[PDB]
Scaffold this motif. Structure first.
Motif, PDB file in Angstrom:
ATOM      1  N   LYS A   1      65.413  37.712  27.742  1.00  0.00           N
ATOM      2  CA  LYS A   1      64.255  36.929  28.105  1.00  0.00           C
ATOM      3  C   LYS A   1      62.976  36.835  26.763  1.00  0.00           C
ATOM      4  O   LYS A   1      62.415  36.240  26.146  1.00  0.00           O
ATOM      5  N   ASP A   2      62.912  38.522  26.209  1.00  0.00           N
ATOM      6  CA  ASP A   2      61.860  38.706  24.937  1.00  0.00           C
ATOM      7  C   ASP A   2      62.259  38.359  23.489  1.00  0.00           C
ATOM      8  O   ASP A   2      61.568  38.732  22.989  1.00  0.00           O
ATOM      9  N   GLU A   3      63.576  37.419  23.721  1.00  0.00           N
ATOM     10  CA  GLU A   3      63.163  37.095  22.376  1.00  0.00           C
ATOM     11  C   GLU A   3      63.115  35.823  22.022  1.00  0.00           C
ATOM     12  O   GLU A   3      63.277  34.912  20.946  1.00  0.00           O
ATOM     13  N   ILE A   4      63.040  34.752  23.099  1.00  0.00           N
ATOM     14  CA  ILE A   4      63.426  33.668  23.359  1.00  0.00           C
ATOM     15  C   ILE A   4      61.487  32.553  23.034  1.00  0.00           C
ATOM     16  O   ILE A   4      61.524  31.702  22.277  1.00  0.00           O
ATOM     17  N   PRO A   5      60.487  33.834  22.868  1.00  0.00           N
ATOM     18  CA  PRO A   5      60.068  33.288  22.045  1.00  0.00           C
ATOM     19  C   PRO A   5      59.890  32.347  21.088  1.00  0.00           C
ATOM     20  O   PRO A   5      59.329  31.137  20.668  1.00  0.00           O
ATOM     21  N   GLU A   6      60.516  33.633  20.066  1.00  0.00           N
ATOM     22  CA  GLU A   6      60.244  32.528  18.920  1.00  0.00           C
ATOM     23  C   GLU A   6      60.939  31.042  19.013  1.00  0.00           C
ATOM     24  O   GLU A   6      60.705  29.894  17.698  1.00  0.00           O
ATOM     25  N   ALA A   7      61.949  30.989  19.429  1.00  0.00           N
ATOM     26  CA  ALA A   7      63.239  29.813  19.472  1.00  0.00           C
ATOM     27  C   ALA A   7      61.985  28.866  19.952  1.00  0.00           C
ATOM     28  O   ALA A   7      61.710  27.711  20.048  1.00  0.00           O
ATOM     29  N   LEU A   8      61.371  29.014  21.187  1.00  0.00           N
ATOM     30  CA  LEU A   8      59.970  28.277  21.936  1.00  0.00           C
ATOM     31  C   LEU A   8      59.473  27.704  21.298  1.00  0.00           C
ATOM     32  O   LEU A   8      59.099  26.092  21.549  1.00  0.00           O
TER      33      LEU A   8
ATOM     34  N   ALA B   1      63.909  31.433  31.523  1.00  0.00           N
ATOM     35  CA  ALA B   1      63.286  31.885  31.584  1.00  0.00           C
ATOM     36  C   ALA B   1      62.354  32.623  31.186  1.00  0.00           C
ATOM     37  O   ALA B   1      62.600  33.370  29.774  1.00  0.00           O
ATOM     38  N   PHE B   2      60.726  31.980  31.320  1.00  0.00           N
ATOM     39  CA  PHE B   2      60.088  32.207  30.252  1.00  0.00           C
ATOM     40  C   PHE B   2      59.013  33.328  30.847  1.00  0.00           C
ATOM     41  O   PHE B   2      58.525  33.347  32.353  1.00  0.00           O
ATOM     42  N   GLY B   3      59.096  34.960  30.240  1.00  0.00           N
ATOM     43  CA  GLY B   3      58.920  35.604  30.011  1.00  0.00           C
ATOM     44  C   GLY B   3      56.856  35.801  29.903  1.00  0.00           C
ATOM     45  O   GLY B   3      56.655  34.691  28.909  1.00  0.00           O
ATOM     46  N   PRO B   4      56.506  36.965  29.554  1.00  0.00           N
ATOM     47  CA  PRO B   4      54.730  37.074  28.719  1.00  0.00           C
ATOM     48  C   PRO B   4      54.842  36.593  28.265  1.00  0.00           C
ATOM     49  O   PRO B   4      53.708  35.793  27.552  1.00  0.00           O
ATOM     50  N   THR B   5      55.822  36.747  26.931  1.00  0.00           N
ATOM     51  CA  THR B   5      55.422  36.824  25.267  1.00  0.00           C
ATOM     52  C   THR B   5      55.763  35.279  25.192  1.00  0.00           C
ATOM     53  O   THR B   5      55.053  34.750  24.391  1.00  0.00           O
ATOM     54  N   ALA B   6      56.874  34.362  26.106  1.00  0.00           N
ATOM     55  CA  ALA B   6      57.058  33.067  26.377  1.00  0.00           C
ATOM     56  C   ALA B   6      55.749  32.452  26.349  1.00  0.00           C
ATOM     57  O   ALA B   6      55.530  30.937  25.671  1.00  0.00           O
TER      58      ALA B   6
END
Length: 343
Positions: free
Chosen positions: A75-82, A104-109
């Motif tokens: 979950k919390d590693e998806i942000p950079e790619a997004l 799965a977009f968590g708070p950070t995403a």
């Protein structure tokens, strides 16, 4: 003009020099690409980064099908790619449709997401289904969309017409915020906020303080959200705001017998109803409302194509059933659903 690697289940931590020359060959030697489907794979950071550069050059891109592209990633590693992907899309002037469902977009995403949504003025159709947003984030998305409306008005861009945001636990919390969002996009055609755990008070507010402002509304689906009488009453008042309404999806909304009777009554007061599909499954609807609904259909819904009433509180053997079936037969158009699970 259409690149896709749909469902190939490719684990892409990065685009290898190999597949770069095969799999994504098109994304490289052709900039006319109008559509891009990446769904059914798992895009790691580097891969995204590579795609990011070859997507930003597709100035004719109109559709970005990026739903289900992170299955198996933390979950919390998806942000950079997004962020890398969304930032690339932001540079495509004709990109009007973008789907990011099943991610799965968590708070950070959120940030990348909010940034994108609040700035991409060419956006016309948004699909954000099943991302476990939750009310907190639910509102952040709604807020960003309000910003989009401001930027669209400023830049004279086309209006947003579709918002599909279901199974994201929007609940009653983000409802005051979403209402503001709908106040911001009164030219919407399709809105589908299914399975968001919204309750009566939220549904009420959403209807009266939001959707009721969208007078261009054609398709509205609030399937699987608790209405009860409260919300039903709300919907009753709102209906008159949507003269162009074609589809009303209220399946599994626990409208309640009295609620459903309110809704049927509101419909009886509308003229020129161009309604085509009306979904009312599992709403504790009872015989008397269905009897009223029938004459209402027969006298005021000449364009009805589909009627779903399964799962309600009345029998398939009640005389209205064959009366409704007779209205459709006589008309040569109209269909009722298989009533094999009445309460």
């Amino acid at each position: 003009a259409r690149f896709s690697i749909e469902g190939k289940s490719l684990k892409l931590d990065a685009i290898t020099t190999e597949d770069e020359k095969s799999v994504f060959a098109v994304l490289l030697e052709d900039d006319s690409v109008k559509e891009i489907v990446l769904s059914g794979n798992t895009i790691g950071t580097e891969a995204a980064r590579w795609l990011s550069e070859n997507i930003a050059s597709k100035k004719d891109l109109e559709i970005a099908e990026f739903s289900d592209i992170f299955t198996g990633r933390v979950k919390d590693e998806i942000p950079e790619a997004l962020r890398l992907l969304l930032q690339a899309l932001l540079k495509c002037p004709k990109l009007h449709t973008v789907r990011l469902s099943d991610n799965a977009f968590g708070p950070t995403a959120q940030e990348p997401l909010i940034d994108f949504l609040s700035k991409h003025t060419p956006l016309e159709h948004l699909y954000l289904h099943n991302n476990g947003l939750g009310p907190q984030a639910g509102a952040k998305i709604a807020r960003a969309l309000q910003e989009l409306a401001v930027n669209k008005k400023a830049k004279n861009a086309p209006p947003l017409r579709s918002i599909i945001c279901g199974r994201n636990r929007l609940e009653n919390g983000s409802m005051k915020e979403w209402a503001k969002t709908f106040q911001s996009h009164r030219l919407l055609h399709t809105v589908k906020m299914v399975q968001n755990g919204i309750r009566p008070e939220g549904i009420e507010h959403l209807l009266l303080e939001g959707l009721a402002y969208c007078q261009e509304l054609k398709v509205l689906d609030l399937q699987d959200n608790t209405f009860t009488h409260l919300g039903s009453s709300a919907l009753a008042i709102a209906l008159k705001s949507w003269p162009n309404l074609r589809e009303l999806g209220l399946n599994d909304c626990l409208l309640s017998a009295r609620g459903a009777a309110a809704v049927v009554d509101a419909f009886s007061k509308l003229e020129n109803i161009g309604l085509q599909t009306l979904r009312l499954q599992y709403n504790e609807i009872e015989l008397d409302a269905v009897r009223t609904l029938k004459t209402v259909i027969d006298e005021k819904m000449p364009d009805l194509l589909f009627l779903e009433l399964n799962g309600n509180r009345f029998s398939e053997e009640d005389d209205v059933v064959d009366e409704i079936r007779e209205v459709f037969s006589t008309r040569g158009r109209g269909e009722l659903d298989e009533l094999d699970d009445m309460e």
